[model samples]
Target chain A: TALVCDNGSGLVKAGFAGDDAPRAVFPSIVGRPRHQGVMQKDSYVGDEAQSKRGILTLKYPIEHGIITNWDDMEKIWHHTFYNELRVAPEEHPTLLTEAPLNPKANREKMTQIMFETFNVPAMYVAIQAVLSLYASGRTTGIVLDSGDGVTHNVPIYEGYALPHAIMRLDLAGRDLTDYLMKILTERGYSFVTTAEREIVRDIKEKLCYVALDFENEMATAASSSSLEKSYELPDGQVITIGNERFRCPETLFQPSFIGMESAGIHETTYNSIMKCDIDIRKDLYANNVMSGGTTMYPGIADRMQKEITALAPSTMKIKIIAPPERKYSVWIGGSILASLSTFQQMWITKQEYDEAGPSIVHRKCF
Target chain B: TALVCDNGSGLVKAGFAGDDAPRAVFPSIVGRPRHQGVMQKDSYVGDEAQSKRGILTLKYPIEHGIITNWDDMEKIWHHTFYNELRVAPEEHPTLLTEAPLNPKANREKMTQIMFETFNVPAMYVAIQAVLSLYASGRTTGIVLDSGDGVTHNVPIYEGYALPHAIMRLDLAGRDLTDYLMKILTERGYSFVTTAEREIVRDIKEKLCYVALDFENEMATAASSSSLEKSYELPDGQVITIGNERFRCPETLFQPSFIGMESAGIHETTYNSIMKCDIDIRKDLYANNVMSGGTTMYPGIADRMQKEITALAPSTMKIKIIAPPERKYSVWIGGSILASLSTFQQMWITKQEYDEAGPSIVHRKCF
Candidate 1:
């Protein structure tokens, strides 16, 4: 049995063996001591990291949905995974999900640090798209993985691979959080601070819903009834966020409203699918999977299904599948891949790594 | 004697009884009535205009430093000036100072309204730079006038002006007031509304100063001996504000500290003086006047003297003449100009306006 890590920017999903759900779901933040210039022995690892201000909280060790800064990454990984869980290096083969088109330099550096510093026996790294497909137990489907920083779509075909089947967009959860924070600030809610941005983030996540008729819902929300809708802050002040409420999540469908000049979610998603091999479009239509933290929003699947359905030809069948614990679907997929005997054949072994060196590893993986 | 009218963005100074000081010191704002669909008959005038918030305020007529979307500027003008001063149309010749390079369209509109409405015996118009010299009792000195919305330095000589003598910058009392408001809001004083921006303006006027050495003064004020500073709001919450004391007025010297991109006041002043004809530079150097609201700061003369002395050549002498009431110096200059027999000749008679039209009147005075 091996322990796999889903190192996302917003949330950390980790589990060992045959767990139905992730054993731990914590915010992806780790605090280091400010005074001594050392990682805190009792570092805050999760939602608790927010409260411990003045101490430096490492952010986006996995930035832009991929690892860029390896030094901080290694420290955070060591502190969070090993110390928090009391896991030993020799215990298990570690399977980690890397972003699609992960920078070659970053990948090589990460692989080296993991092997040498952690002294792990074996390691498996796969793109999140591949893992998400494996976890869903679906052979042919379009996987819409909307994570913290980037929203991506990957199409899988009948137990095989399509190289150009992936689509990536710069719009994601972070953008929505920013829009909500801006709206709140402009409306005289000046109590919102830089540190308290997460409060609005949390509110957006917990209460905001995707409307079937977005403008109408917004109008209804802004009307007299909206005065009844109040969000309470940690400071005990209740703010009645007016009906003309703007949520970043809406940008998934209408990016133009938020001043973004790009093809919106539906158009982008449809275009991305069409761009894949023409023969695979039918198979992709039959199996559509929505994964990642953003998919957890209520009615997202239904709304997406409606949007994509309108764009597709009537001959092609459309199905949108949101996995249970949609946030961890990719990690679970990676875990399933790690457990497979034949999947190990695809992974680079210690001797093979030493012989091929970093160049071949980059070519093989990237 | 013929009269001139120069309606400024602020400080509406009119001279009567031979230019000594302006008979009226009215603020430049006009209020229009929504019900009547015209400018208000009895509008808040001058300093009193600052207090009319809910009934009628800054928004009614003036938008972006100009009269827009309002058919009648008269009602607002009368309320802001005549109502407060009890001056009938028959009484007084008027000289009004306008912005340098005043917009031709706005100037034309203003001229028509003043001539037809007020029907004064004579009217003359002048730019602030020209009026500033007369106010300072210097035919050839650099005039640096800092008003509500803008700060300008103009060089004058031999009762004539250099067209390119003026140097204008966007730094003013409004920017300081805005900065203070932001600082206060960020420090948990969240109840400060847009209405209270005016209060912050008053606070900036009362508390802000130009520090000789800002860093030293900040340190000194931050020390224990510096009394604890607090502002008691209308709602009665006392906000303690003095922990990191600063002299915001010093922004003229250290524009970079306030995130402004420009040369400092001393350099700008010298530049303005240099813009004048070479022969006038000597007289300009001999009599330098610092007028307008900003020059009211106690130590401005000493600081300006020190900075100017370092910048100027040893052969040249720089003198900073500050009137007893710095804010009213321009009105005094206008008064002095009106009193001068030769200066009075510069005015355009009512008969000339009726015969040749307002453009001719504007060309003659301005």
Candidate 2:
């Protein structure tokens, strides 16, 4: 069996390669007094950790979606395999997903850990944007991954990822989460725990929708409480929200408010295409694939198309391809790669590790 | 070689498994789009992130000293291995530390990840408090870990941890950080970017100290500029910090003031010992171990010891053990566990994982 693990900034998603959705989808968090067992040390994982009321210390082992502490990371992987997927590490070949713009050293470390620590038979580390191409059912497209941590435009052309062409921003789903926190905290919604930051995110995912027109939606929201959605917190407290459900996410398209002196996501995509060779631009615009968890919001794809359309030449067709569940689309591509016999040749092997050690991943996998 | 990783909510301390001091220490938060490298994503880790201006997203991947996001985890891991030690992960076995009273599922996740993802020949997950005791050179003790996220008290007997006696409160470094923000924001500091939150943290770490007599200190600070320290912001604007340095940490003792109702750190330590059997309570008082990054303040241990001493009967001995660094002692304990041949046997193997799956860790290691 082949395994695909998308170690997301906000969540951990892992499953057997052939599966449509990950067998295990859990928060990246390891809670204090983890899962209940009188056997010894107790700490909660994901949902269990989130449920406990009193002062749950939420630890982010990854920043901007990369590992800071391997120990904390080791625990998250263990949960995905044993508790969630119930798979043995040595049995399956693994394909780990990573941000395309990652430091060269990170992939090398991943390769070393994969071979030296878990002892897996085989492994492939793939760029997440390149993986986004598979979910779109295409080998050539401009991939846009607007995740919780950052937003980016990555170009995957004919089975190859142009790493130099990949571009991103600090404003993504994480900013939305933070802005929502600012909105609610200002509005007198006292979250029982800062752990409720996730709850705010959930509210953003659920009740939040992009407005076809920003001013129009705000006008409707301010005029009545209808846009104000009431959410039930984990502690049974009801929290009310208003225009924030719409405006907080707008920053994804407008980074200026956060004072990032760059253009919006659409402009970045356009700029990315402008930087490319002339002939490839139209294909990329026609097949602009939108992925990452932040795209799960309702108005995203349509709003993106409209925004992209406005900046684009009127004759040029702008089509955005997005998965119904936008976040896991890249994982789907990795799964597609896993299923193909030809892709298997790209995997770094356990034997290669003994011969060349850590840098083998840098040389072989790419 | 053996590995030591201390996963703290505020920062990460890790290095070679055998080293007396951590080879590297960095903030757990990721600086998105680092300060350098025009390469698409230019973000720094902790210290680098602090120096940069203009809306940097300090991602919290470690919540309450646990791994919250594996993607972020991967990046932080890269910084340690490549930037810090430049060591290879394939060369060493590992001993990672964990919270004393965490859920089993969390460690189950840890084990699978260690073997499946990192691929070490051997590994052991040790309770943080037990490791703290190891650093203190004692077999039995009471431990208090207070840092940026939460404050916790644990009792360790022999090599075993009593999770039942484990307890914690939300008042940690984050609370102090938030309070400092509150104090400044109300005064119209006009933090254009929430990135100022880290500046507030620096103020909390460098300028702030636990008050020997909080009220006395507060009065003295308010009455004179002698206690006022001038801190320059990123914009080169200097701000004076006075009574806030003393008053901000007061909430650690009286959390009720912030409304997250719970006993102070010392009171929690007393309660943890009182909840134990009468016979072992004296031993606990005599060997109290206090270790965490936030306890780095000059008067923290002194205040904690005094507070605990006053709360107990006169005949009972009270001692607080902490490493000089106050942060990596838990990692020190983990390194001690890794050095032992008996502890080496405790590592769950790839064969064990292959045969029994993740549950083998629950049955065999703990």
Candidate 3:
């Protein structure tokens, strides 16, 4: 039997033998009604919960992409997981996708909740990064996972893991969306309201690109006749949006411009590659892979390849792979990982869970 | 006969002898409408035209505090001097206020228009800076004239002009109001539309202030229990305006934060003093005066005096004078200048203007 779960952040794929697609794809959000003590009043799920009314409707349990208020999170988790699935307690084996380098206390709480509340028979938990690599059918390669919560780079070797091979940065799709909104507002596009940030976000996904020469792109777009020119809103008002050409691509080179002090994706990815064991590092040129929502920006892979080649010493060859349906690679990876018989051996039985408790489960799975 | 005038970047104030307030205050703007071959619309006179929409009703004739489009300026001039006042074709002896170091071409244009159109006898064009100094009842002192258009510093000696003694910067009340509107929008107050920029300007005039220590003032206001800390708009919604404490004072010390590259007012004033002739600069401290819409900020004069003193060399004594009804000082200055017999003698007659012609009028005014 397959147990699919969607958490607030991304889709989770899990099964006894293995699962395909996402059994769950829920937004990583928890809401508390403004007029409290009314659990039956219902709360929002996914992007619908981000509206002006939704903000006041829900108290964000996850502050800055990490679970903080456990009680609220547990309530949200139960509704999104078991209630949505209509799954009975003690019915099936469970596999879960969690953040890479999941905090120890959070991991413990998650395990306890599953065992105590659901009385699950068996359970296994794996990092989304590892699962994504497995789903891509890659025996050994770099995995670059960019999601709403964070962007992380993990290197895998010969169908196994390197313990110290993960690197993460605190910049992601949210920053890009916010930057786009600011640019739009500054260029006299007053219609882009805070409530409509998500709509602008969707526009960014559809139209924005990783410009090769950002300054040139901006200049061309700003000039009279560039295709990336003025757009008219519904009110017979026109706003020029050429600044987005420079502002969007700037994330790759100058993340600090957006108030983020962390190194950008280019530097972070290169550093992760360099940290690999010498043999793996030597072969990085042939195995570079890019996955995640951000990778969908046109010309990103080509630009990354070009930039990385300049940074790398000597005549080493470089290759960048963008998997088909790259946005779902993490879910695919989780499914493929669950299908492995050896991976299946990592599961903790319900009897074993009850007998040994959550401590033992964490030690064994981690 | 005496002719009084108060000139600003936004409007030119002028009238015949013995008027309570200047009879005419025409928008100093000069710009053609986007639609060519269409006759330019007249700017609304007096307070009715203070609304941004009201101004937009006419073409923008002035940009960056200068008459940029002469054609539109001509229409605005005709309306203000001849059409709006219903002056006959043979009227002359007009006294007008000119900016200190008024561009020679602008000076020529003004004289040519008066002579060619109105057939004026004689005209007197005097710098508002000189008039302001004379109005303050001081022969040798610095005139701090903050009028509708721009903030200016002009030092005078014995009621005569100090050539090259003027300093101008772009920081103005309009910029402050625009900044306030932008800040309000970012803080989740979306109802303040750009169309209401004039309302916001009025609100700013009535409520905003320059805090001596902005961050500390913000903290105090944030922690304060007073209802005055907030403003209720038309929608029955209130916004806590604690941030204004920091934002308003920022214009004095760090104008660049609002996209202005010039030094803050205190520094700008001190620099202006230093640039004056050494003998005049010595007396400048005694005659220092502050006037403008911005002078209404509580404790601004004291703070400016302190900041300017700290920046000046230890030996240079400083004084900051806050005139009662500071906003009307320039108008008062015009009245005072008109009271001067030497100044009054400068006006020309219609008979003299018709025979001597536009070229002679330009040379006489210059």
Query: Model 2 - which docking category?
Result: incorrect
Candidate 1 lDDT over B184-260, as tens digits, reads 66567652444566677666666666666666777776675563476666668776766322545677776654565
Per-residue lDDT for B332-351 in model 2, tens only?
87877778777767776676
Q: What is the TM-score of chain B alone in each candidate?
A: 0.82, 0.90, 0.79
Report per-prediction Cα RMSD to one decimal.
15.6, 27.3, 16.1
Docking class of 3: incorrect
Q: What lDDT does each candidate get? A: 0.66, 0.74, 0.63
Q: Where is the poorest 10-residue window by lDDT in model 3 chain B?
A: B30-39
Q: What's the true lDDT of residue B352 in model 3?
A: 62
**Candidates' interface RMSDs, in order?**
16.6, 19.7, 18.1
TM-score (C-alpha) between model 3 and the true structure: 0.52
TM-score for every candidate vs. truth? 0.56, 0.53, 0.52
lDDT of candidate 3 over B282-319, digit per residue (tens): 78876787876666677788788788778877798888
Model 3 DockQ reads 0.03
Candidate 3 shows a clash count of: 21
Model 2 TM-score relative to the real fold: 0.53
